[PDB]
Design a protein around this ligand. Structure first.
Ligand code: HC7
Ligand code: HC7
Ligand code: ADP
Ligand code: ADP
Ligand code: MG
Ligand code: MG
Lengths: 336, 336
């Protein structure tokens, strides 16, 4: 649309500057990749200074405090080379670095060399000191909030038993909390959504970059790792309803888990002098830690998915997905 | 107050973490330095990780968008070692690094070695790419806004001629705009308030750090330099009403101006191959540039001061100060 093009043009000229000042409106069109759009400097123009030639316009399409935290977080991760560079912030959105790349696919997560690189990157992320609350209320605080939001949803006319009741989730949350309370896991700065779609394979390699910090917070290490392992099971590119596919046998084997964990710990502990024996203990303990915190991935996203279903119709089977996550929760809990 | 102490304690524990978790309430008291407070970790406690032992709590005591920009800016300057580190952001304020230091005094600005260091630091600041509007509307946009705000002030009962009328400021703004429009000055990321009080002399030296980014924006280089030169004249520590003192003969001489400019340009142009002749031209041009943009410092702060006067009584002579700035404006304009 004319208006959308004009706004993008203005934002690029104003926030990027440099060569962008020389761009004529007729030479720039936005490309959707929807709230996300690519903008590229015309080939004929040389860059002036360090201003980027390739950006993504992200439109917000959220509380004040929330927006402050989100923007500060993005800005800091950019400075630390853990996210895309930040070129403009304005009321409607932001301008970010377009990272030349493609996202990983579900099946690629299991490849040993990529898996090692993901583990290293996650550990790097977990090394960050960020100016946010360090108290680990995010996990159960968010789940408790989601549960309350679900309880408060207006009835829709759908006749099925409420998933909260079918799976006894209010009670089960207490059961999960008790299990996890018995399971030490250090509190670190977590991504919280390290799925394939958020892992960019760089065309100009440090071979990967994480994106999508919507859910990031100080949280239990075990959640970030366990959540990533859960993602090995789900492909969100499936072309028929419900528009995801679960392959439970694709959950990582013990050997695949340990491979990841060894590389994670190599990065996390790189500044430390540890014996082979101490290292093995750290690995074994982390295996157990993750086996329990992985359950929280199912619980968390199942609750989140019920809420998504309340805002959805036929574009994705959110309720179906929720039920998949809760089924796997009880299966894997039973397998501990 | 009990409540203030409790909040500070909670914020420190929650946002700083580490050793702060071990602090008992009875061991921590805030020290005013008022919206700014020092918090120090008890001596007996060892640090756990990289969490700071010495912080400043800054209470806000402002629009959403404004707060986003302010916080992003602070966070970025911290990452780039151009401002204090940022340890917490929350609705009420922030936690910052306490920089072991003291502020400069007015008279110290003229010392050649310090002046050279200030010039270098200002040029460093001007090297920053920041995710904010690059269009230079800040100067006249802000002054136009201030003028409109002054026009809209409720009458108070004070009988004196309005300074806008006494100094024909609406007309004069157009005169200034025309002069500056004829005066090239590159648009860079400016501090906009490089007064002595905002220049910290480090106790653990890079010998200085700037603080107070309230006014920072993309703006004309000439304003930042000229404003700094104006500050050589004013001491805001004067102990009798109006609680500032002006010493007009303390404005930098041509030689003092050129000393500063040489050091500024040495930093600004460090990546460039310039002949002695080209360098001298850059210096001479900058001298003229600054001589004109310095006038905008008087105008800007005079307008700002009228607004401050509307919220003040006996704590500082804002209207008196405004009149000082406007008098010097017309004097220095006449001397061009
Ligand atoms: C577990 N997970 C990490 C939760 C957080 O998701 P995000 O990372 O915020 O996406 C992923 C997840 O639950 C998820 C991921 C993707 C999708 C999704 C994928 C595709 C579509 C779709 O493009 C499918 N469609 C093309 C057939 C119609 C338009 O909508 C809609 C939704 C739905 C759910
Ligand atoms: C030109 N300037 C850079 C404008 C921006 O000021 P800020 O950097 O935001 O302070 C500085 C300026 O105009 C200014 C700077 C300081 C003061 C000021 C200094 C001291 C006080 C004072 O502490 C004086 N008092 C102790 C006698 C009573 C309480 O208020 C009040 C105001 C007033 C004005
Ligand atoms: N900075 C970037 N450069 C290139 N591609 C990106 C960038 N950020 C996100 N993407 C891609 O765009 C898609 C959505 O971006 P993301 O930040 O994950 O938003 P969301 O998942 O909430 O829509 C992802 O597939 C991701 O691979
Ligand atoms: N991070 C810091 N560490 C130590 N002192 C500081 C720090 N920030 C500000 N100060 C000092 O506190 C005073 C006020 O801080 P500043 O940021 O300039 O706020 P404002 O001038 O708006 O009150 C200044 O005198 C400055 O020297
Ligand atoms: Mg994403
Ligand atoms: Mg200050």
């Amino acid at each position: 649309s004319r208006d959308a093009e004009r706004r993008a043009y203005q934002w690029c000229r104003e926030y990027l500057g440099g060569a962008w000042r020389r761009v004529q409106p007729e030479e720039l069109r936005v490309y959707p990749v929807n709230l996300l759009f690519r903008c590229s400097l015309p080939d004929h123009l040389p860059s002036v200074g360090e201003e980027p030639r390739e950006v993504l316009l992200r439109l917000y399409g959220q509380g004040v405090d929330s927006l402050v935290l989100e923007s500060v977080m993005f800005a800091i991760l950019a400075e630390r080379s853990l996210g895309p560079q930040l070129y403009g912030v304005f009321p409607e959105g932001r301008l970010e670095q377009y990272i030349p790349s493609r996202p990983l696919k579900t099946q690629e997560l299991r490849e040993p060399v990529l898996s090692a690189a993901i583990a290293t990157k996650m550990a790097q992320f977990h090394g960050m000191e960020m100016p946010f609350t360090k108290e680990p209320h995010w996990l159960f605080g968010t789940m408790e909030r989601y549960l309350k939001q679900i309880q408060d949803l207006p009835p829709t006319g759908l006749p099925e038993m409420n998933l909260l009741e079918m799976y006894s989730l209010k009670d089960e949350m207490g059961n999960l909390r008790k299990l996890l309370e018995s399971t030490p896991s250090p509190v670190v700065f977590c991504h919280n959504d390290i799925q394939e779609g958020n892992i960019l394979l760089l065309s100009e390699p440090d071979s990967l970059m994480l994106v999508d910090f919507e859910y990031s917070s100080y949280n239990y290490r075990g959640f970030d790792i366990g959540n990533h392992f859960c993602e090995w099971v789900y492909d969100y590119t499936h072309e028929e309803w419900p528009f995801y596919k679960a392959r439970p046998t694709d959950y990582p084997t013990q050997e695949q888990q340990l491979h990841f964990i060894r590389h994670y710990l190599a990065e996390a502990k790189k500044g430390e002098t540890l014996s082979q024996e101490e290292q093995r203990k750290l690995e074994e303990d982390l295996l157990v830690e993750v086996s329990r915190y992985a359950l929280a991935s199912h619980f968390f996203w199942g609750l989140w998915s019920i809420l998504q279903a309340s805002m959805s119709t036929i574009e994705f089977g959110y309720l179906d997905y929720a039920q998949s996550r809760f089924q796997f929760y009880f299966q894997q809990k039973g397998q501990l």
